[PDB]
Design a protein around this motif. Sequence first.
Motif, PDB file in Angstrom:
ATOM      1  N   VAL A 176       0.828  -1.208   0.000  1.00 37.09           N
ATOM      2  CA  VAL A 176       0.000   0.000   0.000  1.00 37.09           C
ATOM      3  C   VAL A 176       0.861   1.257   0.000  1.00 37.09           C
ATOM      4  N   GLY A 177       1.915   1.275   0.819  1.00 40.53           N
ATOM      5  CA  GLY A 177       2.793   2.435   0.855  1.00 40.53           C
ATOM      6  C   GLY A 177       3.523   2.667  -0.456  1.00 40.53           C
ATOM      7  N   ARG A 178       3.984   1.588  -1.091  1.00 42.02           N
ATOM      8  CA  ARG A 178       4.619   1.717  -2.401  1.00 42.02           C
ATOM      9  C   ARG A 178       3.632   2.243  -3.436  1.00 42.02           C
ATOM     10  N   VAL A 179       2.383   1.779  -3.376  1.00 38.11           N
ATOM     11  CA  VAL A 179       1.354   2.292  -4.276  1.00 38.11           C
ATOM     12  C   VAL A 179       1.159   3.787  -4.061  1.00 38.11           C
ATOM     13  N   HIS A 180       1.085   4.215  -2.800  1.00 34.95           N
ATOM     14  CA  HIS A 180       0.901   5.632  -2.490  1.00 34.95           C
ATOM     15  C   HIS A 180       2.070   6.475  -2.998  1.00 34.95           C
ATOM     16  N   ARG A 181       3.301   5.984  -2.809  1.00 36.60           N
ATOM     17  CA  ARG A 181       4.476   6.737  -3.244  1.00 36.60           C
ATOM     18  C   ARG A 181       4.562   6.815  -4.768  1.00 36.60           C
ATOM     19  N   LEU A 182       4.202   5.736  -5.476  1.00 37.76           N
ATOM     20  CA  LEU A 182       4.185   5.798  -6.935  1.00 37.76           C
ATOM     21  C   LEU A 182       3.018   6.623  -7.465  1.00 37.76           C
ATOM     22  N   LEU A 183       1.944   6.775  -6.684  1.00 34.65           N
ATOM     23  CA  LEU A 183       0.863   7.664  -7.096  1.00 34.65           C
ATOM     24  C   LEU A 183       1.279   9.126  -6.990  1.00 34.65           C
ATOM     25  N   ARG A 184       1.915   9.514  -5.879  1.00 32.33           N
ATOM     26  CA  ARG A 184       2.344  10.908  -5.770  1.00 32.33           C
ATOM     27  C   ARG A 184       3.623  11.197  -6.547  1.00 32.33           C
ATOM     28  N   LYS A 185       4.339  10.162  -6.995  1.00 30.69           N
ATOM     29  CA  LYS A 185       5.507  10.369  -7.846  1.00 30.69           C
ATOM     30  C   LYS A 185       5.101  10.745  -9.267  1.00 30.69           C
ATOM     31  N   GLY A 186       3.993  10.188  -9.758  1.00 23.04           N
ATOM     32  CA  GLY A 186       3.516  10.507 -11.092  1.00 23.04           C
ATOM     33  C   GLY A 186       2.993  11.920 -11.249  1.00 23.04           C
ATOM     34  N   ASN A 187       2.872  12.664 -10.148  1.00 24.48           N
ATOM     35  CA  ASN A 187       2.445  14.063 -10.164  1.00 24.48           C
ATOM     36  C   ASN A 187       1.119  14.222 -10.903  1.00 24.48           C
ATOM     37  N   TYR A 188       0.124  13.455 -10.459  1.00 15.38           N
ATOM     38  CA  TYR A 188      -1.203  13.533 -11.056  1.00 15.38           C
ATOM     39  C   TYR A 188      -2.025  14.655 -10.434  1.00 15.38           C
ATOM     40  N   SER A 189      -1.905  14.851  -9.123  1.00 15.92           N
ATOM     41  CA  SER A 189      -2.703  15.844  -8.420  1.00 15.92           C
ATOM     42  C   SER A 189      -1.870  16.493  -7.320  1.00 15.92           C
ATOM     43  N   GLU A 190      -2.448  17.533  -6.709  1.00 14.95           N
ATOM     44  CA  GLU A 190      -1.751  18.283  -5.670  1.00 14.95           C
ATOM     45  C   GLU A 190      -1.604  17.457  -4.396  1.00 14.95           C
ATOM     46  N   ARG A 191      -2.722  17.119  -3.766  1.00  8.22           N
ATOM     47  CA  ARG A 191      -2.745  16.313  -2.555  1.00  8.22           C
ATOM     48  C   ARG A 191      -3.150  14.884  -2.895  1.00  8.22           C
ATOM     49  N   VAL A 192      -2.613  13.933  -2.136  1.00  9.13           N
ATOM     50  CA  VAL A 192      -2.942  12.520  -2.284  1.00  9.13           C
ATOM     51  C   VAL A 192      -3.415  11.999  -0.932  1.00  9.13           C
TER      52      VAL A 192
END
Lengths: 90, 60, 71, 72, 78, 78, 307, 90
Positions: free
Chosen positions: H12-28
Amino acid sequence: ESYSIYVYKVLKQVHPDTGISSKAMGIMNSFVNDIFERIAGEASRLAHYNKRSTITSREIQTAVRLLLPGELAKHAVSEGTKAVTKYTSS
Amino acid sequence: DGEELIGDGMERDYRAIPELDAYEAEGLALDDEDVEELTASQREAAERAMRQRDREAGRG
Amino acid sequence: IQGITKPAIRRLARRGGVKRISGLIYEETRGVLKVFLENVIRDAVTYTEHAKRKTVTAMDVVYALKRQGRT
Amino acid sequence: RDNIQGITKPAIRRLARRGGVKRISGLIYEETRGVLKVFLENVIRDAVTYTEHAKRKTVTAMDVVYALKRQG
Amino acid sequence: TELLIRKLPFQRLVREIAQDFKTDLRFQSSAVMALQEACEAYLVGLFEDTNLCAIHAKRVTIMPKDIQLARRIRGERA
Amino acid sequence: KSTELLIRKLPFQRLVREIAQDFKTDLRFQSSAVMALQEACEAYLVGLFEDTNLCAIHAKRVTIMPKDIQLARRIRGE
Amino acid sequence: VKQDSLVINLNRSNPKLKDLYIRPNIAQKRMQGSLEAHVNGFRFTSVRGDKVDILYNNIKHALFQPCDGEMIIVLHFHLKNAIMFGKKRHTDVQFYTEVGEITTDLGKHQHMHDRDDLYAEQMEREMRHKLKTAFKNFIEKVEALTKEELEFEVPFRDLGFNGAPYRSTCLLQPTSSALVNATEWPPFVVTLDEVELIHFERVQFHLKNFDMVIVYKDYSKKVTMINAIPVASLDPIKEWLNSCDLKYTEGVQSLNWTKIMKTIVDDPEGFFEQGGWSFLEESEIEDETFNPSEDDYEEEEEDSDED
Amino acid sequence: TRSSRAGLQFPVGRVHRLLRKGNYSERVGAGAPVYLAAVLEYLTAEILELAGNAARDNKKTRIIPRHLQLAIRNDEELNKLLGKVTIAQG
């Protein structure tokens, strides 16, 4: 990068006696990467549809219910809800 | 009136010939060389400009 | 220069179940192949150019393919 | 039969008049109704999901156009 | 193995059509294989649609008119 | 913005209710939503009828038949 | 091939039904008439007087296709021996009746009265009812008259499939002892108990459809190739293949059936001497298996995103 | 170790970090990665079940590309979902 170990673990979960060839394993990585990117693009679009500066689990639930057909959508939101009620149980 | 594909003559087109069933190493990256893919912002900007000039359709 | 072997086109016709082709389809097939190739290679070369390097990788290919709907 | 079968024939012939449609036969009515139900169900699924995840029970036009541009 | 279109002519045509737009490229073997396989799959799909169209017209012979009709019904013209 | 006299509004809204009862009961629509629905539906139907006439005239016949409908669907993927 | 002369009984009234267009056309102009059941065969007549004699024992399968779901109701007959009438030799002879559809008038001269709301679909439904009731009475009466010598067959339209065996694509419908489609003339008929095995061609990663090969128990007849059967009909056909329980196998390559039947006809012994129909069914070297000892060393890198 | 708190194998943490790494949105958000890993593990488990059952009906231990093809072919909810893909061999 490579998410092969988690797939090997769920493979042991459902059918422990099975294995997998490396070609099919790379195809598995490609498929999981593609579906993750599709649902993530849908969620990044919903980060602008509903005007929220952040992405909650409701957005992921919406993306699952949209990108998937009838049975799989409900059968996946079930697992999603079980895991989120597990995380909310501390 | 036309040609044929069912009957005699199909198996000749599937013949295995080594000098044609293989590739070539011209303009091919060495396997020892390490190459890094795009970042998110690079590919997003590239595809945004690409869609804009696809509406444009400048070349042709 | 339009270097596609004619028996390759015959094998393609057989994989699609085609039975009777005329002596004219080869040029049309080569043209459509070039049509699809030019667009996909343009997408791939753009992806390689914005990556700040000159190497074409399979990841560029799949990213170029993703836009149409084939992954 | 269903509760109601669908739209009327002159509506379909006006739809045809708007296309280049010429020489309409007498079977396209039922197939048009069936494909209409199929495509309508495919789009209303997404529409009602968009309205339910927009925390309201009123289906506006914006949800409709969102679904149309998602399907592409 | 019995396979479809041979690798070398396709790779040469791809290199020619790629040097048409950009010069001094570095290719990976997997990239060329992916190009060949994706083109082959799309071509088989379009060939299948073309055979359907030629069969719809009560003809056993395939002609480029079927190709253009399939391409336009797909929505691939501009 | 010219898609009006093709479809009567009353059977349209009756069919919207028949399809809304299946998935989520007791939802409400604004009039602008209904007009957008009608516009999109007539647009897709006229496009499919155009493609169907293309296939029918391709069949050396001038008549439109359900085979053209199913061929257009199967190329489109319905 | 010779035939049998038809005989008439004036002692009692025989079955009768009119409004059957013959197919194929006797003169190049399409023609309509009437049909009667007699002691030894069916007598088809018309306003010109074309005397079509269809012997009862000469009917292998009696085919009927109804008028609900299709604009034309068809009574099709397959003969054992082809018969010559109108200077034309025919083996399959059908007689069909229409219900009525518009074919034109799309705004160039289209009257406003489609908007008059006549509700003519109710009249159409009653006409369909009258036709199907009359046809039912005719079929029961001819079942009584035949002494149950031959039996008609009605197809399974609901679980049929889409297929293009001929130059034109159509929809094929299984029956009790046949697979037939007489709607798209020329009619397609085949008997189930005459086919040894079925071979499927061009099965692979997602394609729109497939080819299918019908191989007969005899070998001087070419195998019947039905093309263009959708994937949605793949296993449903198998659901019907296990009904009469006939063997089916699949393959990817399209086969050279001309040479197959030539090799069968010239030297039949050697084909079964090698197993028979045994052509219907390294890799690790060609495909490495994942090594279950390669793992990512990096762990517990999840980090904290707070409350 | 938030993956143990989530109750599923996927990181789950790796998923979260790869989600905010892709710079899709401001807050995650804090709950999106849990639900995302949940649905990803559900789909991975279901497809691995299908592939293992296909390998059992094929009389083999490992799953190869052909097993995956035959598994998604006999599933209308994966043919109508991911029938528009491209994988042949390697």
